[PDB]
């Protein structure tokens, strides 16, 4: 049995401001730093250690991973940082306040923009300051890879091949992997591993700062998955 | 003209205790964290940015690099962490107090153990708790690669091939490199780049927390090297 550990980052400064974030590279709040450190200490105490780590190119995830690795005394671990694990891109909604947006355009419209499976937020133009093409960390991306907007469906289209092309082959080689990433790139991955429908994934929100452990059989079929930590605290956070 | 930036980490807790450190994985003090952050801010203000970073597997160097990358807003940068950039291994002296050692064995003997070019500190045995073979981050090393002790000469024997086999080819490919490392692994590299003799390198101490910039010609021969920062502060630190 091979284990995989997933961790969603904690509170960012834009979560405190209630803003759509997407690929905007906002930092963790002090509270989200504390959540990362608590997750790493809990992993140590439950006896987990790793051989390799994946994360995104967004600092709220990278800093989560760095804090977890420090609590494990594994700052030396090999790390790969990939845009393919980035949060869903929120198009022209990036930076707007969610409550103000719901007031101006309607609650139902925001519910569709946030959670309709293949519904896309309104698009950026390439001349917008927020277009990823202007940012040096995406220098190697093609037009087609640079998003103007993403739904969960489009997020799935880029996270699952990376899982299949890169992360899963490394696990098959016997390496113990940790992934530190984001709400919708982890909803994408969990939808796939758990064979969930569109209707099922609609309801799922992964709790922040909570280790999610997958067990895989000899054929790398998932056998079970579970959270580490205080059950009442975690289940509340998942709501 | 291609540029390379070197940075030595700052004060560790064992530097404050005046202890031989070597491969012992001690953390930065608050003062050494501040030095890392100051070096990164200075690099930003002087207009430097990077495409790739190398460091050791020792957290005082890794944490220096992480703080520098945060000040540059390049936490997303690809990082390679290699034991081949580790500090010189201090053998059985690791953990001892330098002043107590000089008292018990003599000042001249400690001067030879610290700085005789090919003089080796007294050796560990493989059963010692400090033997690197017991530590998971060296799992892939051979007996021959696991040190019992190192002189500067032996440090050179492992740092320069890594430069020639790995770092320099990446620079030739047009990538802007930063290296965050240690006193004697950087003395090894500077001896080589500056074509210094044994007598010359004896005197050289690279100041901590100070960007050292190399310029390379079209044939990757070094053309010049210089420090960034306040000259009086740096020259004092170099003493
Ligand atoms: Cl890293």
């Amino acid at each position: 049995v091979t284990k995989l550990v997933l961790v969603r980052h904690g509170e960012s400064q834009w979560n405190k401001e209630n803003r759509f974030t997407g690929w905007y590279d906002v930092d963790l709040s002090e509270k989200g730093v504390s959540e990362a450190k608590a997750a790493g200490k809990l992993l140590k105490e439950e006896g987990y250690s790793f051989d390799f780590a994946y994360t995104s190119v967004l600092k709220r995830a990278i800093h989560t991973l760095w804090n977890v690795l420090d609590e494990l005394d594994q700052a030396w671990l090999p790390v790969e940082k990939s845009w393919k694990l980035n949060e869903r891109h929120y198009g022209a909604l990036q930076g707007l306040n969610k409550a103000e947006t719901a007031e101006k355009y309607g609650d139902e419209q925001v519910k569709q923009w946030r959670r309709g499976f293949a519904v896309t937020p309104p698009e950026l133009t390439k001349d917008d300051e927020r277009y990823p093409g202007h940012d040096p960390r995406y220098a190697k991306l093609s037009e087609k890879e640079l998003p103007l907007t993403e739904s969960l469906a489009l997020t799935i289209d880029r996270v699952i091949p990376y899982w299949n092309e890169t992360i899963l082959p490394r696990m098959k080689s016997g390496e113990r992997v940790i992934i530190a990433a984001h709400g919708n790139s982890l909803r994408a991955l969990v939808k796939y591993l758990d064979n969930m429908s569109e209707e099922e994934i609609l309801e799922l929100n992964i709790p922040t700062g909570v280790p999610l452990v997958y067990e895989f059989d000899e054929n790398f079929k998932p056998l079970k998955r579970y959270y580490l930590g205080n059950a009442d605290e975690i289940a509340a956070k998942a709501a």
Side-chain angles (χ1 to χ4, degrees), chain A:
Chain A
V1 169
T2 302
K3 288 190 186 182
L4 170 71
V5 176
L6 311 179
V7 184
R8 183 186 176 167
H9 69 75
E11 184 191 72
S12 81
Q13 182 59 34
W14 274 20
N15 185 275
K16 226 156 97 204
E17 309 179 22
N18 191 27
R19 294 176 81 167
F20 297 100
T21 304
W23 286 27
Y24 184 74
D25 194 22
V26 67
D27 220 329
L28 294 172
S29 66
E30 142 222 77
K31 171 181 174 197
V33 172
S34 293
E35 299 186 308
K37 290 179 182 173
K41 179 190 201 249
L42 174 61
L43 279 161
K44 173 68 135 45
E45 292 163 351
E46 301 262 8
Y48 285 77
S49 65
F50 303 98
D51 301 302
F52 197 97
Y54 292 92
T55 189
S56 70
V57 293
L58 303 175
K59 70 181 72 168
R60 64 198 182 264
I62 298 160
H63 289 168
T64 293
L65 178 60
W66 287 355
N67 282 293
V68 163
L69 293 179
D70 283 337
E71 295 293 338
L72 294 165
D73 201 18
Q74 295 197 282
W76 52 264
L77 205 68
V79 174
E80 180 164 322
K81 305 182 187 93
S82 176
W83 68 271
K84 300 175 183 180
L85 292 173
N86 276 9
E87 184 59 280
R88 170 268 293 273
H89 194 284
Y90 244 129
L93 302 180
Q94 286 187 182
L96 301 181
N97 179 282
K98 297 186 180 174
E100 291 169 24
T101 300
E103 187 185 345
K104 286 192 168 106
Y105 295 97
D107 270 339
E108 188 45 49
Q109 175 64 73
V110 169
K111 289 186 182 323
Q112 299 300 309
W113 281 337
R114 288 191 68 257
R115 282 291 177 278
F117 183 73
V119 179
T120 45
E123 265 172 12
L124 298 175
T125 58
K126 299 190 286 193
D127 68 294
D128 193 296
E129 313 200 310
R130 299 171 288 180
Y131 183 52
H134 310 291
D135 183 303
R137 85 189 75 183
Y138 308 113
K140 298 186 210 184
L141 271 65
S142 74
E143 178 163 8
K144 162 74 27 234
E145 290 168 317
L146 295 165
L148 302 165
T149 189
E150 290 180 316
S151 60
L152 184 62
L154 295 174
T155 301
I156 287 156
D157 288 345
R158 59 159 166 90
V159 170
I160 288 334
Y162 184 61
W163 164 256
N164 277 319
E165 297 169 9
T166 296
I167 307 181
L168 177 59
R170 184 166 299 276
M171 297 168 59
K172 291 181 164 163
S173 76
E175 294 182 26
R176 295 164 289 179
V177 169
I178 183 167
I179 306 175
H182 301 271
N184 295 305
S185 49
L186 291 172
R187 280 168 79 231
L189 182 55
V190 167
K191 190 187 180 298
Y192 187 74
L193 297 176
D194 296 6
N195 308 129
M196 288 180 157
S197 66
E198 294 183 24
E199 290 73 20
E200 279 166 342
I201 199 60
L202 176 61
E203 300 299 74
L204 177 79
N205 290 281
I206 298 166
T208 64
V210 177
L212 168 54
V213 184
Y214 274 77
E215 295 189 1
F216 292 85
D217 71 13
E218 335 292 359
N219 295 312
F220 289 85
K221 168 179 197 174
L223 290 160
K224 78 183 327 258
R225 78 283 292 134
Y226 47 90
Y227 295 123
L228 302 181
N230 177 286
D232 280 8
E233 290 176 21
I234 296 157
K237 284 165 89 160

